[PDB]
Design a protein around this ligand. Structure first.
Ligand code: GDP
Ligand code: GDP
Lengths: 171, 174
């Protein structure tokens, strides 16, 4: 209930998309499943391009992996961008940084609010939120409304606080 | 829908359960999407265990990745399963032997003793793909002395070969 309750004010007619992306194995499917806002439906609109969507009324959460095109069609009604990083994966945090910056430079996403989930904080030497803020260069983002939330998606810790912040921004 | 028409001999009151498994990246989600038998729904029944499901009438297609142990929740799926589809990336010579081991561990599971096995040698459009005869030997299918099995070469992205294999599977499950 608590997640559907966050979107009560955004309920309406204009369909707004929340896009949640990050490297493979960051935790994005796990997060979608923890929202309990509807079934996770997988589509393949182009060969090689797997998309996961949960449609709750006029709000859609759309997920895909970034990291080593047709994406431009999704950006139109995208009001929020959630980037999920595996805070335990130090080998690939520089690649995450490169994919985040590549998303933020899309002109079709220039007015989008950015929520960063620093996920897998339960793991013994996960990087904390301040450290991920450094590795991702978030303080260098000067004209973006952003926020970083430390999370453990398997237990749900932090998901509500992150999404509460985001819904407030889209108000 | 050709695949809907193919499966019609199987429609009834009793829930037909087809399991499609394989190593990650074998092409299983692509196959499910190509069948056009309804939406692919992902659930996570237990931590770390992503299951994809397509429900067509009384027929359910369930998918998950193997590779890396048989859990008890797996055995529960096994108990109600009539067909096992094992999908192999035919171009992944590095991991074919792991695919063999995972298929053999499943087939030794007593809950699956009566299940019909269909192997998809997928990704045949790629130039170094192992053909069906080589996958047959790599996977040890001829050493299955009590199992009803069939192997079908496929290219799941074009959708070709899938009909022939499911045709065979449906006829066995009849
Ligand atoms: N330890 C830990 N594992 C997680 C967490 N979130 C997700 N996972 C695991 O990471 C793996 C991949 O997660 P998944 O949601 O499929 O990632 P995706 O590829 O981004 O969709 C699974 O084994 C999940 O259980 C977390 O906060 N802590
Ligand atoms: N060349 C080729 N690629 C394929 C084929 N089938 C699937 N793929 C691709 O292999 C990758 C994994 O496919 P997917 O269905 O997600 O694999 P899964 O992890 O088993 O679900 C994707 O990039 C697919 O587009 C095929 O017959 N040929």
């Amino acid at each position: 209930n608590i997640f559907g309750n966050l979107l009560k004010s955004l309920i309406g007619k204009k369909e707004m998309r929340i896009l949640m992306v990050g490297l493979d194995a960051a935790g994005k499917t796990t997060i979608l499943y923890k929202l309990k806002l509807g079934e996770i439906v997988t589509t393949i609109p182009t060969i090689g391009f797997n998309v996961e969507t949960v449609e709750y009324k006029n709000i859609s959460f759309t997920v895909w992996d970034v990291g080593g095109p047709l994406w431009r069609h999704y950006f139109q009604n995208t009001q929020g961008l959630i980037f999920v990083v595996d805070s335990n994966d130090r080998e690939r945090v520089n690649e995450a940084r490169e994919e985040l910056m590549r998303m933020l430079a899309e002109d079709e996403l220039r007015d989008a609010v950015l929520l960063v989930f620093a996920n897998k904080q339960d793991l013994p030497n996960a990087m904390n939120a301040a450290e991920i803020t450094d590795k991702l260069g978030l303080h260098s983002l000067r004209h973006r409304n952003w926020y970083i939330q430390a999370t453990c998606a398997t237990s749900g810790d932090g998901l509500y606080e992150g999404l509460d912040w985001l819904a407030n921004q889209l108000k």
